[PDB]
C-alpha cells in the first residue's frame, strides 16, 4: 500500500522528518527479519514511501527557494530552465526583434502591401 503524496503535501516539514525516521527504523526492523525468513515483500512499500517523502520534502524546499528568488534576475542553476545549451545561448526575441531606426522607418513607410490581381 504505502503512503500517498497528496496527504503529505499538506503536512509541515517536521512532520515529514518524523515520518521519515520512523520509516527508516521500520526498514531496519524488516531487514533484520529478511535474513530469517525467505521472503519479505513488504519492504518494497517502505522503500517506496521513503522515496515519496523525500520527493515531497525536496519539492517543498525548492518551491520556497523559487518564491524567495521570485522577481529578480540571477536565480539558481537548478531552479531556472534547462532547455539546451544552444537555446540558452541564443538571442531572445527581444535581442532578435531589434532593428535600427533606419529600418523601422522603412518598414513603417514601405511594408509589403496586400494586393490582388483580377481588376
Amino acid at each position: 500500500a504505502g503512503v500517498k503524496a497528496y496527504e503529505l503535501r499538506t503536512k509541515s516539514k517536521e512532520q515529514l522528518a518524523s515520518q521519515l525516521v520512523d520509516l527508516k527504523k521500520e526498514l531496519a526492523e524488516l531487514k533484520v527479519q529478511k535474513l530469517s525468513r525467505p521472503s519479505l515483500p513488504k519492504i518494497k512499500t517502505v522503500r517506496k514511501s521513503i522515496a515519496c517523502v523525500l520527493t515531497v520534502i525536496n519539492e517543498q524546499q525548492r518551491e520556497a527557494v523559487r518564491q524567495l528568488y521570485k522577481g529578480k534576475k540571477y536565480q539558481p542553476k537548478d531552479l531556472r530552465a534547462k532547455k539546451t545549451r544552444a537555446l540558452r545561448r541564443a538571442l531572445t526575441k527581444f535581442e532578435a526583434s531589434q532593428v535600427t531606426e533606419k529600418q523601422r522607418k522603412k518598414q513603417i513607410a514601405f511594408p509589403q502591401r496586400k494586393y490582388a490581381i483580377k481588376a
Binding site: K114, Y115, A116, I117
Partner: protein, 49 residues
C-alpha cells in the same frame, strides 16, 4: 585494348565515380513537395499571386 573499327570513346570513369552517383529517385516526391510548397506559400500570401 584497341581493337576493331569502332570510334575512340572518351569515358571519364577512371576516378572513384561510384562514390558519387546520384540517381534521382527523388523526382516524383520532390515534385509533390514543390506543389505543396507552392500551395502553402499561396495560402500564406492568400490574396497575392
Amino acid at each position: 585494348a584497341i581493337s576493331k573499327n569502332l570510334p575512340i570513346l572518351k569515358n571519364h570513369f577512371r576516378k572513384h565515380w561510384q562514390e558519387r552517383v546520384k540517381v534521382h529517385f527523388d523526382q516524383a516526391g520532390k515534385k509533390v513537395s514543390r506543389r505543396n510548397a507552392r500551395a502553402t506559400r499561396a495560402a500564406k500570401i492568400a490574396p497575392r499571386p
